[PDB]
């Protein structure tokens, strides 16, 4: 399970209401029970939570992949998380409605999610689409086809950068601010990307903002590997502000991400060493 | 032949599970396929098979039918001109040939 | 007549192209490279890192940078996961914190 | 092949259902996979490419009618292959000149490939025939003369 | 208000640095007069409330107007404000970037309809919906 | 003066055109050919596949 | 950093042979880098450093 957090917690813990589902018994009595939900992927959006290809099992526990499910929860609270996710809610006879629509497109396997000023930009490799979130009503998201050739690569192959998306459309990188598509590798590094990714394992393939620095690379496993690693080794990084494109290096990198160094390195003072000395004690790179 | 079945009532309560099971008077190979008259109340698994499993659900009367075919081999008359074009829907694809 | 090469940064790798149809401000492969509209330099390097003595026997797999929690104070910390479990560290000493 | 090329990052491929009673790759190494009707059998052969381009009177730098004396073509390719050059002219603008000659500019060995033409009006042609071919023309660059008219 | 401390009944104080309320409108020389949410509940203009945003890095420090639209920043995810005239919902806040974020609460101010923001890495001036890098 | 021919894959195959009225890096006729914007090469052949 | 094919088309003949001499460029900070130079007498290989 997504097992969140709690901002006034020190534990971990599984989401409130996940599973709970509102089934109305004779005579229309309602009631409320709680199955086996598997998700693969969870974002924030709208002050809302999503789910990706949802494990959606019920009474008589043979499993349904419903791999084009697609649910969304009520808005947040004060220093909490949302606390439904059922859509047969108000049946037990005004504002905070989830549901789902179970696309239709090819390949399925909805693997991303992204949002982008206020619009959401669902990737499934194929067919990607729209989020065009309502204040209040019967259909409070309205998803319309955008593309019937375009979609992403990996679970988290895409960023925003300037109000667009880097996007791996499976043959380039795209870069659309909605409603248009553009090529940032149409006949410079195609050949090149498609080569390198396409020989040890493409799913591994990732993205990060260099915000720091106006960068967004694409890391990638190197092209010596064994095929059942996922470090990726090599990065294709490319500036958003001169359109160049470089190639660079990393760690045998897992993930990545943004934070702030230790204290030694956060700014320390000089009345702080009282225990450090000039003997470098596993300490040299400062 | 006619099919009969040794199960015609039951009570169940919601929670209850029960199991049914269909047999024709030939001891053949055939295909099956259940059916309910009234939406709900019921969740069915592996329709396909001679033992079904339900599990009430809700209140109300229902009536369960297990409709037995003779599945047989045909040909069709997809000619060139008229080949298939193998639309896609919910991963479900499909034939739209004419005539057919 | 005149033979200038300057903005050398102004456009970087450019593969898959006739390299003697380029320009000269152009190249056919770099690494470790990075570019600012009239200059090239080498890109920063890469160096280890240990918030404590503990994490440095640990194979992570994603993370975040929670920069507020009830508890702590006005300090930020990580939520780090691994294959069978979920740490916390906030450079004074790592915590399990999966839930039980 | 150890390591073909690839145009995906999963590695898709594009394939057709052909008539010949099987299936068909469309975009693959040299080979093309011709039908006669004679025998009744599948013939497979080398892909045969050709270019074509007419009636280059050289307007854009001296007057069309003038004779021009065609000596080189100095292009400028890249990879490896075997190209098949072929060129010729008239004395008209109208007419698909007749060919004059035909050279091959094997790639790493030869510069140039050598034509002698006087013709007004000259037609180059390029055809690829080999199988172990990956070569690439980005440009040309032809070596030429002016004579006369009329 | 930005960060607010809403303490209750049972008064250990819960901190909810995403919370945001807006009071009624002004009088003849005078300020607001009502913050309360939980009003019209006794048994019709005039209404309050909050949005309890949900971003990164929180702190919702800063705030500042563009052309009737807010701007919010908290050093990560800005938002926009977009108040109606009178209905349930008043404003409503769409997200706007995912990066941009103001550095210190008063590191903004309106220029030339649009904002002269610090993103953490240098300086931005978006008119709305685009912006620039002035260094 | 001078006389360069380049880009011969900017543009392709213009045909129901007087060859004698178009650029250095056209054609009148091509077959098997793949341009990318600077360059010409054989395209890909054809295999079969089961 | 790599750039093969320098034909400078743009000042004389590519099929002309060019003399090298120098390469004076304009850096800024300090360091030590590592120049590299070669060539062929084709324009399909990637020339051997000399």
């Known amino acids: 399970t997504p097992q969140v957090k709690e901002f006034e917690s020190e534990y971990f813990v599984d989401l409130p209401g996940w599973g709970e589902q509102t089934v109305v018994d004779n005579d229309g009595n309602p009631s409320v029970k709680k199955f086996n939900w598997k998700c693969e992927r969870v974002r924030s959006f709208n002050n809302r939570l999503f789910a990706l290809n949802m494990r959606e099992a019920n009474a008589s526990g043979v499993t349904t992949n419903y791999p084009l499910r697609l649910r969304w929860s009520n808005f947040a609270n004060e220093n909490k998380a949302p606390t439904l996710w059922d859509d047969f809610a108000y049946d037990r006879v005004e504002n905070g409605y989830a549901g789902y629509i179970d696309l239709a497109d090819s390949n399925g396997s909805l693997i991303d999610i992204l949002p982008l000023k206020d619009y959401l930009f ?28 375009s979609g992403i690569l990996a679970p988290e192959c895409v960023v925003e950068v300037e109000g667009s998306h880097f996007v791996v459309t499976q043959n380039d990188v795209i870069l659309h601010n909605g409603a248009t598509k553009k090529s940032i590798a149409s006949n410079r590094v195609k050949n090149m990307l498609i080569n390198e990714v396409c020989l040890v394992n493409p799913l591994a393939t990732r993205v990060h903002l260099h915000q720091d620095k106006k960068e967004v690379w694409v890391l990638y496993v190197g092209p010596g590997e064994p095929k059942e690693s996922f470090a990726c080794t090599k990065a294709a990084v490319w500036n958003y502000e001169f359109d160049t494109w470089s190639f660079r290096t990393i760690p045998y990198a897992q993930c990545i991400g943004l934070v702030d160094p230790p204290v030694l390195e956060r700014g320390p003072i000089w009345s702080d060493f009282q225990e450090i000395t000039w003997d470098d004690p596993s300490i040299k790179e400062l | 032949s006619s099919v009969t079945l040794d199960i015609v009532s039951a009570s169940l309560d919601v929670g209850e599970e029960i199991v049914i099971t269909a047999t024709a008077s030939p001891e053949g190979e055939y295909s099956y396929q259940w059916s309910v ?11 396909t098979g001679k033992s079904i499993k339900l599990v009430a659900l809700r209140k109300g009367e229902i009536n369960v039918t297990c409709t037995v075919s003779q599945m047989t081999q045909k040909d069709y008359d997809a000619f060139d001109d008229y080949p298939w074009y193998h639309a896609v829907i919910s991963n479900c694809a499909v034939a739209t040939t004419h005539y057919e | 007549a005149l033979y200038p090469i300057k903005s050398l940064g102004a456009v970087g790798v450019i593969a898959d192209q006739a390299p003697t149809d380029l320009a000269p401000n152009a190249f056919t492969n770099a690494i470790n490279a990075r570019f600012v509209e009239q200059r090239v330099f080498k890109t920063g390097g890469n160096a280890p890192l240990s918030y404590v003595d503990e994490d ?14 009830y508890y702590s104070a006005g300090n930020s910390f990580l939520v780090v996961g691994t294959n069978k479990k979920l740490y916390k560290l906030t450079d004074e000493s790592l915590t399990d914190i999966s839930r039980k | 092949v ?24 469309v975009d693959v190494g040299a080979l093309d996979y011709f039908y006669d009707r004679l025998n009744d059998v599948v013939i497979e052969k080398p892909l045969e490419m050709r270019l074509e381009r007419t009636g280059i009177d050289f307007d854009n730098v001296t007057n069309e009618w003038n004779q021009k004396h065609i000596n080189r073509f100095r292009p400028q390719t890249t990879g490896s292959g075997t190209y098949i050059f072929e060129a010729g002219g008239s004395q008209f603008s109208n007419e698909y000149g007749h060919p004059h000659t035909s050279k091959t500019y094997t790639i790493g060995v030869d510069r140039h490939v050598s034509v002698r033409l006087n013709h007004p009006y000259l037609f180059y042609n390029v055809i690829d025939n080999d199988v172990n071919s990956n070569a690439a023309i980005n440009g040309l660059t032809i070596e030429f003369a002016v004579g006369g008219r009329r």
């Open chain 1, 122 to 149: 669902v990737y499934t490799e194929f067919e990607t689409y729209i989020g065009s979130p309502t204040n209040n009503t019967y259909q409070p998201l309205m998803f319309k086809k955008l593309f019937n050739d």
């Open chain 2, 37 to 47: 008259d009234k939406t709900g109340y019921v969740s069915t698994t592996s329709v």
């Open chain 3, 56 to 69: 440095k026997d640990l194979t992570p797999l994603s993370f975040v940078s929670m920069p507020f929690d």
């Open chain 4, 2 to 25: 150890w390591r073909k090329d690839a145009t995906n990052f999963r590695q898709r491929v594009t394939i057709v259902g052909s008539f010949l009673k099987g299936f068909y790759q």
